[PDB]
Each structure stands twice: as C-alpha cells, then as structure tokens.
Design a binder for this molecule. Structure first.
Ligand SMILES: [Mg+2]
Ligand SMILES: [Zn+2]
Lengths: 141, 70, 422, 176, 38, 131
RNA sequence: AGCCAGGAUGUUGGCUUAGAAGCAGCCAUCAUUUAAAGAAAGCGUAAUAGCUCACUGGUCGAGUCGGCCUGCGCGGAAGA
C-alpha cells in the first residue's frame, strides 16, 4: 500500500541492518523507525551470510505496519570476502574475478535458489550464471 | 558546496535534517550562511573547522604580494 | 490588566517584547529563560515561518510554558484553522484552540470562545477599548460546537480523575476547564492559540485575559535550580518568594542614550532595596546596587524597591554580562545558563580614518559587551580585526551603530585567508 | 486526408442547412453557422455529412479536412456543447460571476470585469474557479484564453489563471 | 528566443514550424530551445 | 521487429504444439505488471511445461493462420488480446481453469478460456475425475 | 500516426566492499521471465515518481518511412 512514497534501494554492511545515520540522504525522508531496524535482519540473515547486505523489501504500511520477505545477498555480491577477491566487475577482462570454482558456483546457484524461484531450478541457475558473468569473468567449469 | 570549490564527503541523513559533510576551502566561505539561509529558507546552519591544506591555481595570491608589505 | 469585561484585580503583567531576526537571536535567547511564559504570535496568512520554528526551539530549550496568538485575521488569505493545523504538523505541538474566528478579512468582528460560549465583538467603532459579549452566534455554532467539544477532551486528558469524570457524561465547570488546562500548561503540555487582529484591535483584548488564565506566575512556574562556585550542586532552589536573600538574574546590558549602563535585572528571589551590595558571582567581583528603574506605561518610573518576579533595570559601573547571576553574598553563585550562540558570519572591518583603529577598538569593545552573540577578533596572519556576528544583518546593524552611537565610520571587508606554501 | 474522407454523422434532431457554401447547424443548445472555404464540396447523404475538394483548387484537401473538423465541432456543440474548466491558483484570487460578466479579483489594483461574448455562460462552483459553457468551440477557447491572459500562470508558485487540466511546468526561484 | 540565422532542433522535444514564412522551433519541454529565423 | 518470415515461423511454431498437443488456456491481459504476468507464467510453466512464451499473438491473422489447420471452428480467438500456455496433462485440467480462477485474484483477465472444438466439446468442464 | 498496460527475480548489476541506487564516480550483463529491463541519454538525479531508450499486446484499417540526386523558390538580407 505504501511502497510508492518512501523509496531507497540501499543496504549498508548488515552487521546491523540499516544503521540510522550511516546510509545517505534518501532514507532521511523516511518515517520508518529504528527500534526494529536491525533486530531480525542482523540475526536471522544466517540463512545466507552475516556481514553481507540482507536484500529486503521497503514495504511498510500507512497504519505503521511492516511486513516483507528479505532476499539474500548475491553469490557474486558474496564474492568480495567469501569468494576471495575484493576486486571484481568492470575489469574482469583486465583483472580476475577471483579463484572462483564452478564446483562451488553451481552449488551456490542451486542452494541459493530459494529467493529467485521459477518453473525449473535451472532457470534460476542460469539467472545466477549470468549474474556472476555480469562481471565478465565466471568460473569456467 | 560544489559551486564553491568544495568537495563533499558523505551526507548521512538523520531525521528532521540531513547531515552533509564537505571539506570546503575557507576562501570559498566568507558569507556562506546568508546565502545558505537563502538556499534553506532560513532553516539551516553550518559549522566549519579547519582541517588541512591543498592547492587551486590562483595568482590572486600573486596579486596580493606588493599591495601590502611587498 | 484587570480583565476584558470580566475582571479580577490589578495584575502587573510584565512584558518583554521579542525581536524576530535570527541575526539578533540572543535577545530572544536571554529573554526566554528570564520569561515565565511566552505569547507565540503568528501570522494568520503567513502561518509558521523559519523564525517561528527557530523561536520554538529557543523556548523548548527552556521548556517555557507558551500560549500562541494568531495575528492578522484581516488580511485576505488568512485562516485561523490552517495556521492552527500548521502548529500541529510543523512543530509537533498539540495546538488546543481555546478560541475561534468570526470571519476573515473584512468579516472579522469577533471571536467565538469555547468556554464563555459567547463571541465578544469589540466596539472598535467608537474605541477598541470598549467591548461587548454576544450570546451563541449562528454563523460558527456548528463549527464552534465540534471545536469546543475538542477543547473539553483536552481538559479531560489533563487530569486522571477528570478523564474518568469526563467519561461520566458530565461537563466541566468554569474552573475545572481552565484549572485543568492551566495546571499542565505550566508543564509544557499544549500551546493555547487565540486569534485576533492588533491592527483592528480585536482578539487582543481577550488575549491578555488568556495570559492571566493560563500563562504561569513566578509562584506557578516550578522553583529555580541553583548551584555554588565549588559544591558541584548546592541545590540552591531559591524559593521565588522574596523570603530568600536577594537573588536576581541579569539578562541585558544597555547602551542607554543618556545613563550609559541600564543593565536590566530580573529578580527571582529576595529583595534589594535602593542601595545594597551584591557581587558578580559569575565574575568574582563586588559593587553596590544603586538606582533601580522600572518603565511602565512608557514613563520610565524610578524605583527604590525591586522584588520577587519584578523585572527592572540597574544603573552601575561594574559589568554584569547577559545571563549573569545577581545573587546575595549568601551566593547561590552559578545559575545554570552558560550558553551564547557561536558567530555564524565573520567579516573583517577597519575604520575609514586610519587613526580611529583605537576608537574602533574601544567601540567594538563596548558593542561586544552589549550582546554576547557578537565576537571581535585579532587573527595572526595580520592584525586585521574580525567582527564575527550571527547574521549578515546582525553585524550590518553594528557597522552603522558605530556610525550612530560612537560617531566612527568603518569599511568592512572579506577576511584575509591564511595562505601557506610548500 | 482521412480526416475529410470521413462523414460527419449528424445525431438525431439536428438541423443542417447547406445553402451554397455557408452552412448552418441547428441543435438543442443553439445555432452555429460557418462560411466554408469555396474549395469544399459538402452533401447531406443520409444522416452523414461528407466533404470533398473542389476541382481547380490545389489546396482542396487541407480545406476539406479543416471544414470537416469545424463542422464536427459545430455539431458536437449544438448537441452537447463544449465546457471549459478554469481555476484560480494564488492567494486572494477570486472570480465571482454576475450573469454574463466574470468579476476576476486577480491582484491588480484595478478591478477586472471581462464581459463574455454572446454565447458563453460562465459559472463558478467555488470562490476560485470558472466553468465556461458555450455552443461554439472556437469562441469558448477564445474566452478561456482571454481570461487566462489577465494573470497568466507563473513559473514559481503556479499563481494565476490556469486551465483545470493545464500542466504548469514550474521551477525553483534560485539557488539564491 | 534566439534569432540565430540557423535554427536546429536542440532537443528530442523540439519541432520545426513555418509560421508566416519564418522557420521557427517550438520546444514544448525546454523553453530555451525556442528559435525564430533561418 | 517481427519480419514476415519470422512471423509465419513463430505463428506455426506456437500453433503446432497446440494443434498436435492437448487442450490449453489463454488470457486477455493488456494491463498487468511484469510481476503479475511473471508469477502466473511461472505457475503455468510448473503445471504443464516451460515451452510456453508469455508473449501475445492475437493479431488479425496470427490465429487465423495457425488454428485453422484442423477443427477450424476453433479459430474464434481473433478479437481479444492473448498470451496462451499449454497443458499436456489432461484436457480441461487445472491449467485450463487456473487462469479464470485467478481472473479476479492477482491477475487482470483470462479471456474466459474459450477452449477449442478438438472433440467438439460443449459448455461443460471436459475432465471430471470420477475417482 | 492516434488511442489501452508494462520497461524483472542477481536488479542498490559485486560493478573503485559512500550508491553515483534501472538512466555522471568505471564498466559489460536478458540470466526464468520476454513484448519488455536498456541493466543507460532528462527531469531525482542521491533515489522514487510519471513520462523517459525501444518494444510488443489490443483498437480501427491505407499507405508510410527515411536518405540520395535533383528544378524553382524560403530565411540568412541593416543607412543615411
Ligand atoms: Mg538566397
Ligand atoms: Zn528545445
């Protein structure tokens, strides 16, 4: 109901989801409070990882209600401290995307296939497969 | 702040205001607030405190060499 | 002011008018702590505006019990209810409208009170000074009925017993309505708003009556917190009644056109009497207290006696700066206020005649004592003086005060920026 | 083109009178008459109204489409009529109406009374908005543009006479 | 408007018109792109 | 950018699976979000198969060239906008009705699922589980 | 051409672990979904918003779209 007026797609390092004065000048004009801002998104994120921005929705209600289903950080997004390289997209032809293996890339595309579903899991698999090579370098296995 | 030769460094938005940091040169700030109030409808104030030094091509300092105390 | 057709004995209402510019906001800073209450005037068409929120923050810092006046109902495009709602959403206040507007522009003749349930239309035609009540006007009776009912709900939530009594289906009397609304207005609950037009002189006569009805007395406002020089906190609550030894608060030195001192002093507790001795407890200095002057009815009355809550001014030599305490030798030395705004605009300055640097030094010395929100500087790149003030106008009405007060002319300039090389 | 090559199908109850070139259309609202450019051929043809370019006139098709659109508007006027809606944004801008005169209070020291042309009836459902009704499209558009020109909208606070659907592109006063 | 001896479309929203034997540009979106002659 | 060659190819390709396949469903969805036509399409692909493209082909001769191969009375889908989905699992299955079930829930419209005269069926549901 | 919606789930593409957030810090990306997502070119640009790249889908049904060579014209073109 209220998704249209408040609008910021941004997630800082989610050790504490959405710290108040840490993000930037889009959430300042957003009445959403801080009491439940990092309670269930700093602990219940363990289904994917802790330290990565928990992909979540920005849906609140005009009646002050808040319901959303948080998605996960990408396997490519996780490829900054978990898949080795702090460098990445933009220069995958002039740099490496990391010592990335497909023995792990396929397993990550299959086990993180919960949020982006589809008719066949191979569809979300190809989705993540383009998402990693969206940098330009992906595990060649 | 960018009109002035100043560089912005983060702009967290706390509620009921926005906090905007920028290490602006001191020369580009000698009437700031009156102009800032024009920009903010008199609803903002600025606090400045010297940090460091850098350069911008200005022979205006060569202009002021022999006018006073050559 | 005795009362607008309903009267209850001489009250010495003591009034400090306040300026409106952020430039000179220290006169509103000092004159808000010194105040027990505050009449938050407002433009019925302009509404709430940068300075209105600014002075709102000023009062909130001192938690001053404030009621609001809504001036300028004759101007086209003025509406009381809209400005009332602005308070509710621009300042985060609870603006209980204890009055109502009878018309706008030319229509404005009177105001619907929610407790008298009458609308007194003043006799502006002969003189505003004359007034007259009118029973239940039809024009606003539906609007007044709903808005008056809203006022009773605030009176109810005012007291716990009252709330339940309000749930008893019974209404409230001419004392529980006001006494309920008043007793917490003392404690920063809700700002009472009345409409009027000081140009056409309506609304105002009633506004004075509301100040007596709801705005606090030195005996109604909570007692003042106090402290000594070393004791981190000698409680030093000076009971307001002048039974404690004399303990005042000085809030403004004055460039009196003739006397040259005229430092106003607001006496909280105690009684100084036409010649006594008190020390500058904030400065560790000592001197007497000679010629109190209180100006009433614009006649500059001279007084030999000033007492609890009695605002007056003093002629003396030794300086007492704004926010400086004037307690007895007993000495509840420090009063909590140690706050003055930092200058937001700093400009260089130098005289036109090269030999008035000394005169411009002494003039700026004096004009720096007259208000704390005006610094003077001497930076070390060069001896150049810097008159750092609050606003452009704040220090632009001081470049010409030297022209007026101390007959010295100055030419301002941008400060020289310190340029080091490597 | 395919404008003029499309009949103006008259409703039930409208009286068209094609006398030479100039043509009248009677209706439930009033009467509208138009002098067609001589390069136009028009016939009734069984509840319709068709236009065709006269021979000897290179600009026959432009005038054909023009006349067809004008007579279509005349027909819609005599059956329905066109109703323009204007608003007064700006403080103290009020536009009370007295019969055939629109008393605009638009901020000038002098009073503004624009006497409507014959056929346009202005009404005001509010202190600050006009609703013109009329039989002819061109003249009602002209009266709207006449009213709007007194205090045109302005780019800063939208103040001035505007059409109800008008999309005023505003801007900020200055940085300063 | 500009009275350049050469009118061109400066925006996607500009249009070339020939009011009264003069070739104008009428931009509905940016009123700076409004040109007169040539 | 549908060329004539590509046009006759795509019409035939989307009509052959319905001609030699089974009874399917279509919608009338001219006003839906990417999400509405996406989640319903995922459901439809889960029900029968991932072969169905959610694109619409209701041109004045798209079905009038593909549907008219046999049981040409089933060429009644020309007037309204349509993006179909197949259902190999049984005639008049859930998929042949799920569109009309969602027609008022999280979806705009479903073209009433006009059906087709493959066996020349009349107004009724084609498969009933006697079970 | 007009008229009826939409322009994803990595989707803040990780993309210089502040974002230049679908449209400046740099780049290569349909990968279910496809008619859509370009993963950039104005409104905010820091997002949104409703229009934007485009594209289909439906509506009704006749030509249209661009460039090239060309003839005669048009503006450019103000003096006592
Ligand atoms: Mg020529
Ligand atoms: Zn333009």
């Amino acid at each position: 109901a209220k998704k249209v007026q408040a609008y910021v797609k941004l997630q800082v390092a989610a050790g504490m989801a959405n710290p108040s004065p840490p993000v930037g000048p889009a959430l300042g004009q957003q009445g959403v409070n801080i009491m439940e801002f990092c309670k269930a998104f700093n602990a219940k994120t363990d289904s994917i990882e802790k330290g990565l921005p928990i992909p979540v929705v920005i849906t609140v209600y005009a009646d002050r209600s808040f319901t959303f289903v948080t998605k996960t950080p990408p396997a490519a997004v996780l490829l900054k401290k978990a898949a080795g390289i702090k460098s990445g997209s933009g220069k995958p032809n002039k740099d490496k995307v990391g010592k990335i293996s497909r023995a792990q890339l396929q397993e990550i595309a299959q086990t993180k296939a919960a949020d982006m579903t589809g008719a066949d899991i191979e569809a979300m698999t190809r989705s993540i497969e383009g998402t990693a090579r969206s940098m330009g370098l992906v595990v060649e296995d | 702040l960018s009109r002035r030769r100043g560089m912005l460094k983060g702009q967290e938005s706390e509620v009921t205001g926005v906090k905007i940091h920028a290490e602006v040169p001191l020369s580009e700030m000698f009437g700031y607030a009156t102009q800032l109030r024009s920009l903010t409808k008199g609803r903002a104030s600025y606090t400045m405190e010297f940090l460091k030094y850098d350069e911008a091509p200005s022979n205006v300092a060569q202009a002021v060499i022999e006018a006073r105390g050559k | 002011w005795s009362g607008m057709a309903k009267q209850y004995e001489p009250h010495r209402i003591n009034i400090i008018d306040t300026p409106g510019h952020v430039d000179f906001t220290i006169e509103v800073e000092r004159s808000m702590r010194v105040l027990d209450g505050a009449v938050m005037v407002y433009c019925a068409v302009g509404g709430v505006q940068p300075q209105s929120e600014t002075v709102w923050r000023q009062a909130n810092k001192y938690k001053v019990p404030r009621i609001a006046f809504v001036n300028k109902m004759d101007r086209m495009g003025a509406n009381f209810l809209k400005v009332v709602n602005q308070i509710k959403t621009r300042l985060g206040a609870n603006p209980v409208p204890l009055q109502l507007a009878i018309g706008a522009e030319e229509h404005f003749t009177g105001v619907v009170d929610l407790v008298k349930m009458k609308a007194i239309n003043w006799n502006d035609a002969d003189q505003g000074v004359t007034f007259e009540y009118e029973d239940i006007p039809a024009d606003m009776v539906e609007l007044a009925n709903e808005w008056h009912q809203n006022l009773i709900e605030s009176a109810a939530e005012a007291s716990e017993e009252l709330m339940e009594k309000y749930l008893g289906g019974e209404e409230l009397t001419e004392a529980e309505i006001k006494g309920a609304l008043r007793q917490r207005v003392l404690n920063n609950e809700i700002i009472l708003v009345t409409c009027g037009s000081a140009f056409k002189n309506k609304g105002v006569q009633a506004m004075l009556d509301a100040v007596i009805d709801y705005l606090p007395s030195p005996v109604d406002v909570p007692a003042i917190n106090g402290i000594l020089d070393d004791g981190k906190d000698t409680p030093a609550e000076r009971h307001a009644s002048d039974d404690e030894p004399f303990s005042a608060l000085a809030f403004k030195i004055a460039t009196d056109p003739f006397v040259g001192n005229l430092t106003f002093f607001r006496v909280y507790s105690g009684v100084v009497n036409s010649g006594d001795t008190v020390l500058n407890s904030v400065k560790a200095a000592r001197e007497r207290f000679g010629r109190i002057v209180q100006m009433h009815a614009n006649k500059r009355e001279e007084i030999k006696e000033v007492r609890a809550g009695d605002i007056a001014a003093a002629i003396g030599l030794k300086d007492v700066t704004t926010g400086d305490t004037l307690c007895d030798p007993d000495a509840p030395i420090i009063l909590e206020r140690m706050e003055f705004p930092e200058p937001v605009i700093s400009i260089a300055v130098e005289p036109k005649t090269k030999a008035d640097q000394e005169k411009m030094g002494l003039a700026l010395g004096r004009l720096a004592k007259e208000d704390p929100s005006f610094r003077v500087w001497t930076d070390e790149e060069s001896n150049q003086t810097i008159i750092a003030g609050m606003g452009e106008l704040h220090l632009d009405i001081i470049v010409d005060r030297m022209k007026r007060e101390f007959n010295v002319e100055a030419n301002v300039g941008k400060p020289q920026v310190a340029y080091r090389e490597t | 083109s395919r404008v003029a090559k499309a009949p103006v199908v008259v409703p039930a109850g409208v009286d068209v009178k094609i006398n030479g070139q100039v043509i009248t259309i009677k209706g439930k609202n009033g009467e509208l008459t138009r002098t067609l450019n001589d390069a136009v051929e028009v016939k009734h043809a069984d509840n319709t109204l068709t236009f065709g370019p006269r021979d000897g006139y290179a600009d026959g098709w432009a005038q054909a489409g023009t006349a067809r659109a004008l007579l279509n508007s005349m027909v819609i006027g005599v059956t329905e009529g066109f109703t323009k809606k204007l608003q007064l944004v700006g403080v103290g801008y009020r536009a009370a109406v007295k019969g055939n005169v629109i008393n605009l209070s638009l901020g000038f020291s002098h009073p503004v009374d624009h006497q409507l042309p014959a056929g346009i009836t202005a009404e005001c459902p509010t202190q600050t908005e006009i609703v013109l009704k009329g039989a002819d499209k061109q003249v009602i558009g002209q009266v709207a543009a006449d009213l709007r020109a007194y205090r045109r909208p302005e780019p800063y606070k939208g103040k001035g006479v505007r059409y109800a659907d008008e999309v005023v592109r505003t801007k900020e006063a200055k940085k300063k | 408007m500009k009275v350049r001896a050469s009118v061109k479309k400066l925006c996607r929203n500009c249009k070339i018109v020939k009011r009264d034997g003069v070739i104008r540009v009428i931009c509905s979106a940016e009123p700076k792109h409004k040109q007169r002659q040539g | 950018m549908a060329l004539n060659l590509q046009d006759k190819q795509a019409i035939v390709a989307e009509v052959s699976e319905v001609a030699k396949g089974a009874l399917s469903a279509v919608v009338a969805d001219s006003r839906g979000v990417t999400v509405d036509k996406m989640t319903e399409l995922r459901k439809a692909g889960r029900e029968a198969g991932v072969y169905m493209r959610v694109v619409r082909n209701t041109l004045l001769r798209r079905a009038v060239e593909g549907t008219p191969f046999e049981c040409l009375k089933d060429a009644f889908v020309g007037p309204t906008l349509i993006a179909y989905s197949m259902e190999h699992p049984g005639a008049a299955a859930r998929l042949f009705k799920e569109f009309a079930k969602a027609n008022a829930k999280f979806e705009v419209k479903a073209a009433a699922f006009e059906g087709e005269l493959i066996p020349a069926s009349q107004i009724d549901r084609l498969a009933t589980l006697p079970t």
